[PDB]
Amino acid sequence: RGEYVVAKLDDLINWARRSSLWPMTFGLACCAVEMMHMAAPRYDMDRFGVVFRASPRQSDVMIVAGTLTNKMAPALRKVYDQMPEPRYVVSMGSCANGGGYYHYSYSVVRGCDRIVPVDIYVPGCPPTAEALLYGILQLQKKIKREKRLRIWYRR
Amino acid sequence: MWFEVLPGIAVMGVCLFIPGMATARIHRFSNGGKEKRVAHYPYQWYLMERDRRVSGVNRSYVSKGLENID
Amino acid sequence: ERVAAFLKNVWAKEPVLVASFAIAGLAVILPTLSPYTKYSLMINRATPYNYPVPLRDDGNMPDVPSHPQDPQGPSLEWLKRL
Amino acid sequence: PGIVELPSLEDLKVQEVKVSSSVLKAAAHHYGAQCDKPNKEFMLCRWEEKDPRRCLEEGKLVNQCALEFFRQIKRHCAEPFTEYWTCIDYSGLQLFRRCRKQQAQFDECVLDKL
Amino acid sequence: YPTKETAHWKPPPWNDVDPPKDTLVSNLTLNFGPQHPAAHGVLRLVMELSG
Amino acid sequence: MFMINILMLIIPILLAVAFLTLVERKVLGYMQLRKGPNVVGPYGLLQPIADAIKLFIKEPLRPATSSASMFILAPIMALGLALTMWIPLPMPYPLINMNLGVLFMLAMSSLAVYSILWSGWASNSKYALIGALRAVAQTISYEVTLAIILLSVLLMSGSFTLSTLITTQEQMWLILPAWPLAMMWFISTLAETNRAPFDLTEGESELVSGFNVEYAAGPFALFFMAEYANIIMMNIFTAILFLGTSHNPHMPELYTINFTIKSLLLTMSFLWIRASYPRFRYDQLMHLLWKNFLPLTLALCMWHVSLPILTSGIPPQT
Amino acid sequence: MNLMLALLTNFTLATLLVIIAFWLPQLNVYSEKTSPYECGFDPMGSARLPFSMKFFLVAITFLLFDLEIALLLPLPWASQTANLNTMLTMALFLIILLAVSLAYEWTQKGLEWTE
Amino acid sequence: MSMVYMNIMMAFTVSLVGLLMYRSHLMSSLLCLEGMMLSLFVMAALTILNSHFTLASMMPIILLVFAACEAALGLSLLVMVSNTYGTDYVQNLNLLQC
Amino acid sequence: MMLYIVFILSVIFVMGFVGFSSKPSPIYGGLGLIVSGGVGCGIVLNFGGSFLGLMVFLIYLGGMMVVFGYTTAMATEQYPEIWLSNKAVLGAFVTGLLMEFFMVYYVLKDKEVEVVFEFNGLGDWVIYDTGDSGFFSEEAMGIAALYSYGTWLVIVTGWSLLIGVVVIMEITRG
Amino acid sequence: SMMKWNRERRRLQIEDFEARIALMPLLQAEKDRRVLQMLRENLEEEATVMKDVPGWKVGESVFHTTRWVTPMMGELYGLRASEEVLSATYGFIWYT
Amino acid sequence: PFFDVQKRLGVDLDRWMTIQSAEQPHKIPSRCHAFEKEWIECAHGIGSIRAEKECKIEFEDFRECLLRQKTMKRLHAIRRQREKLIKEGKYTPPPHH
Ligand SMILES: CCCCCCCCCCCCCCCCCC(=O)OC[C@H](COP(=O)([O-])OCC[N+](C)(C)C)OC(=O)CCCCCCCCCCCCCCCCC
Ligand SMILES: CCCCCCCCCCCCO[C@@H]1O[C@H](CO)[C@@H](O[C@H]2O[C@H](CO)[C@@H](O)[C@H](O)[C@H]2O)[C@H](O)[C@H]1O
Ligand SMILES: CCCCCCCCCCCCO[C@@H]1O[C@H](CO)[C@@H](O[C@H]2O[C@H](CO)[C@@H](O)[C@H](O)[C@H]2O)[C@H](O)[C@H]1O
Ligand SMILES: CCCCCCCCCCCCO[C@@H]1O[C@H](CO)[C@@H](O[C@H]2O[C@H](CO)[C@@H](O)[C@H](O)[C@H]2O)[C@H](O)[C@H]1O
Ligand code: SF4
């Protein structure tokens, strides 16, 4: 049966991608400090297979951890475009989510989703390190639900 | 705990043990149960080539003893 | 006195170079003082890479042996005891 | 410029010593002592004459002595010798130092019996 | 003997020293950040480098 | 039967490399008061498999400005040469028994540098170029001292054959009569493998990713597999050189176990060192080798020429 | 043969891994994705512009020193000579002249990088 | 002669022509000098090895040593040429026509 | 086909020479010299000179590493030239290959060839020695003799290398 | 420790080298007959192949001197299967 | 030599490596040792002008040993004549060949 095979192959690639999520070493403001605390020993994001890598060419996730200003917006879009696919964006904190405390500023982008597509929105100012980890595990369960091969089979 | 690092080390150790064990056993299988003949110098190659002719079966590792001298 | 004053200074500032020169000096010096150096050349001479071509016995070579197990010819008793 | 004179295939015939190098190496030291005379007469001939064609007769006496030497071992010390060169043959380098025990058994056998 | 092909030849310097060329060896300019582990994510340090 | 032997060498190499990545992350983790991968498979045992599958289904990118052919060639050279380094290794029997195995390993190590130089240059990006030129400096720093360190050791072994080192060390490890050289050799292998505190051609905190910054997915994985294969191979080389395992011709697997344990611990030492020290500055690496190791290495080379002659202990040629 | 077979197998294995890496994954190529990386902003000047080498003199010295080891690597074999008096003198002579050349370049500030 | 000599002599001639037909980069010509020495090393090694001229086996090694002294000398001048003009172009070295 | 191993490697030897002799960017010229140095090591090794072959490869790998560094510093342009990018480089490259291909085609067809001088194309093995059985490498004995017979060679080479360091320091001290 | 072990290794090398010296006479005698046999066979099959050739003389030397000259590889294995030629020319160099 | 200081001082600087029949390590002989010895001894002391004609036989044999051009011509001819008969179906090699 073709369906059974592509169903199992979807599980394999979905498992491999969520089990090995490499965020780009990309932080913007206060929220990056809680992101640092997710890598710290108490939460040890490495133990889920989550490893920071500096190069966008070697990153699977962009965690927008902090305010995105207008001056920074073209750079964030640049490094997002330079990530190979599949790629995911996690929006962390009120600033990234929708402008937050600086929503009405002349120099702030009112939400990073004006610039890049966003898979998960982590609320808080900042979200606790555990709240960000909950957001990453939520991203994993989203990847687990993907049906690329199943949809390809029925094209 | 630190001993939870051991399982990955053991897997790494078994994988690194395989090439040495495999090479040693394939040499015995391919050389009639003995070590592969080592010929670093022309003299050693000469004798090995002479053993190939002497074997009568074109194998330098098939040995002939007293039973071959009448 | 200056022998120790200079040496102490380099020991404090560049012990790596002090060790280098001391080791190099021993390499140059000890080979001429060692009593075992003479055997290095004897062992190299006693190693037979070549066939020992026999000599045509012409009737008057007493110092040469007729058989490999004859008393004549060089011996390696010194080598077994080294 | 001339025809190269080659011996006929008949003249090149002799009963070969068909044993392996491990057998030859295991018996080398005794063979060096027992067959010294024809061996050293062949090697003087080759080095003086500088022509393989000019030492064929001496070559055959080297072979004949070798066969006679190996027949003595077969008659009197076959089993101790077969153990010894079997040990030598195992080594990839055919090292003497791995078979001192079997060498001693072979050495004392030939000493007592020959 | 002046000729057309040597009309542009000038006598060499009196002391053999030709003046140094005004050629400019350009420094390499590098964007160090913002996306950089050592730039704290928001520093665009524009650095001129020779090597 | 030789083709089977080749596969029984390089399939295990790549599997050992994959699980060395897990071991490093766990060892670093516990040294950092955390755990490291323990969710993907029991005790993280499936984590290397996940990463490998992830990368090879990731989109590979050819940069717009890159030189296409050289961009592809470099990772192929990196992994190909890394696997070639293993063929003369006596464990205890080499796959290929070479008269000049040590010289072969030196030559192949030099050729592997060009996979760094060409990948960085072919990327046509500034961080990649800076990384590649750091590899030029690194090679200039260690290569001369590395060869002369080996020479001094081989003056006791008597040959360039790797299997002779087993014979040389049958009574005693060469680490005893040559621990100063072992010290300098061990550091040189860290520089040779681009390992911390000499991780300069990648230098993440400085160059983002250095020579491989433009590489993604499978092409990037080839560079990772190459480096980690060289780390294991260089510690096997260190074990053979200085911690010779006794070889029983009738029980060759006892050699393999003892030798494998030694090589593992030396590899663990590389991870341990990475966990402990800050990074060198790449000009300070060059001054380390030329101003400290080289004067000492030259002196010790003089000593190890003279010592066998003066003690009447020159090794056999064969 | 064994050697050529081993090299061919290694470099063929590497080539196959690259072939799979390029033909198996789904691709989506556009201009911005393949643009050169420089931390988010476009590069200023080509990466092919000259890159000054501050260790140029050590690099040339490496060539001379790298040939010395070619002269020294035969030393294990030279130690089997019967004429050990000459061999030991010439071996030490060569290494000392290497040390003298190093000491000269060191004292003359050849090992310091140009600033 | 044996057929190997056809390609080694050909390789020497190719590099000699490469040396004598300059382009712009001075580095490219220095490479052709190094290639010429490589063919001479191989050509000499074959003769010596095939004829069993035992003592001549060191001659190719000596050839490489003075090859490096030439390459190091060539690179030293390239550094000075580059410092003066900012390129290694050989058309800049035309001051001495006059 | 394997009996023609030295010939095949020598063909690649020439192809590498045509590579860097046509003079593309020195980056690619260095690549061509590495290939030639690699196969050149293979040629010499097949004549019984394992040490000579590996040594020339090792030296030339170190030399081309320096050349690479100097190239990115002093011999680079905005658009480095490959063999296809330039008309003069391509013409020399093609001319070299065609001259090479025709020498190969005719030497194989006739088992002989006249290219100025006569070369025999029976295969290179025919000239090899027929009787070897010593317990040493003759190349290793000859090279090691540099330290017992070559006292004079050791002195002049050692002195030249020392002077070489002194000279490059002088030449590059503006 | 290394001094004592290397001294013993040198005494072992001498024993190994002497066993070869004992056997060299026999090996030399075998090599001479084999070389002469191969050359004789080459001569038999030269006559048949080159019987019809106008000016050919079978077995003619290229040397003015009548001194024995050691044959080169092509002379000895000139008319034999590539398997034997390849083994005789490159067998030693290609052995691992 | 233009200035023969080696002879005046009786010091051997380079003539130990001038010829292949000179003393080699471990008495390893060159392949053409006999031929070059015969040529050198034929031409000794009489000068090149005489040696060019009076030692022509020795030099030609020595040249044949060195480059083997006449042997390769001979073998090329036999191998050609064999392929002539193989295709024409006029000769079957023996089993031993
Ligand atoms: C050490 C080496 C490690 C190697 C690891 C190897 C990975 C092992 C696991 C393989 C899982 C199966 C592959 C699935 C991943 C495919 C990537 C993907 O997600 O594509 C989604 C795409 C989705 O396409 P789509 O049609 O649904 O939509 C994409 C188009 N737009 C953008 C418009 C929507 O799937 C496919 O297109 C085809 C899926 C086929 C799955 C079977 C793969 C066959 C492999 C042959 C490929 C041909 C090239 C030869 C390569 C070598 C063959 C081995
Ligand atoms: C910048 C220029 C620097 C030049 C430096 C030159 C330093 C040379 C120092 C001398 C090196 C050799 O030193 C010398 O070695 C030989 C053998 O090796 C020793 O000779 C000793 O052993 C040999 C055999 O091994 C015996 O023949 C001899 O009877 C015995 O005395 C000498 O006793 C020793 O004086
Ligand atoms: C036979 C081989 C073993 C013998 C050692 C051979 C190598 C000798 C190395 C050079 C020795 C003298 O040359 C060298 O001169 C310079 C002067 O600028 C000194 O260097 C000086 O500045 C440099 C850089 O700051 C540092 O090394 C040091 O702080 C200081 O001493 C070295 O301390 C001295 O070692
Ligand atoms: C990157 C590009 C690299 C280009 C490399 C170019 C390599 C050069 C090609 C050399 C090809 C040599 O080709 C070789 O010629 C000889 C001709 O006798 C053939 O040898 C032949 O000998 C006998 C003659 O009795 C035939 O019966 C046999 O069938 C045939 O093998 C080889 O089978 C062939 O392999
Ligand atoms: S969301 Fe809050 S914590 Fe995060 S960057 Fe904005 S202000 Fe700082």
Residue numbers in the entry:
A (entry chain B): 25 to 179
B (entry chain a): 1 to 70
C (entry chain b): 2 to 83
D (entry chain X): 1 to 114
E (entry chain D): 20 to 70
F (entry chain H): 1 to 318
G (entry chain A): 1 to 115
H (entry chain K): 1 to 98
From the paper:
Complex I is a 1 MDa multi-protein assembly that is central to mitochondrial and cellular metabolism. It oxidizes the NADH produced by oxidation of carbohydrates and lipids to maintain the redox state of the mitochondrial NAD+ pool, reduces ubiquinone-10 to drive the respiratory chain and oxygen consumption, and pumps protons out of the mitochondrial matrix. This proton pumping contributes to the proton-motive force that drives ATP synthesis through oxidative phosphorylation.
Density was observed in the Q-channel, close to its entrance from the membrane, in all three major classes. The density in the Active-1092-i map occupies a similar position to the densities observed in the other classes, but a smaller additional density feature is also observed further into the Q-channel so that, together, they resemble density observed in the Q-channel of the active-apo (inhibitor-free) class of bovine complex I in nanodiscs (EMD-14133). With an IM1092 molecule refined in different orientations into the density in the Active-1092-i map near the Q-channel entrance, C-Cmask values are low (< 0.5) and the shape of the density was visibly a poor fit; the second density was too small and featureless to ascertain its origin and the identity of these two densities remain unconfirmed. The NDUFS7-Arg77 guanidinium is ~7 Å (slack) and 10-14 Å (deactive) away from the bound biguanide (N-N distance), but only ~4 Å away when IM1092 is refined into the density in the Active-1092-i map in the same orientation, indicating that repulsion between their positive charges may disfavor biguanide binding in the active state. In all active models, Arg77 is much closer to the putative biguanide binding site, presenting a source of steric hindrance and charge repulsion that acts against strong inhibitory binding and explains the unique preference of biguanide inhibitors to bind to NEM-sensitive (deactive) complex I (manifesting as a lower IC50 for deactivated complex I). Overall, ~65% of the imaged protein population is disrupted in this region, and disorder is observed in all three major classes, as well as in states with (e.g. Deactive-1092-i) or without clear binding of IM1092 at the Q-site (Active-1092-i). All six classes from Q-channel classification had poor density for the ND5/NDUFB4 interface, consistent with a mixture of the three lateral helix states being represented there.
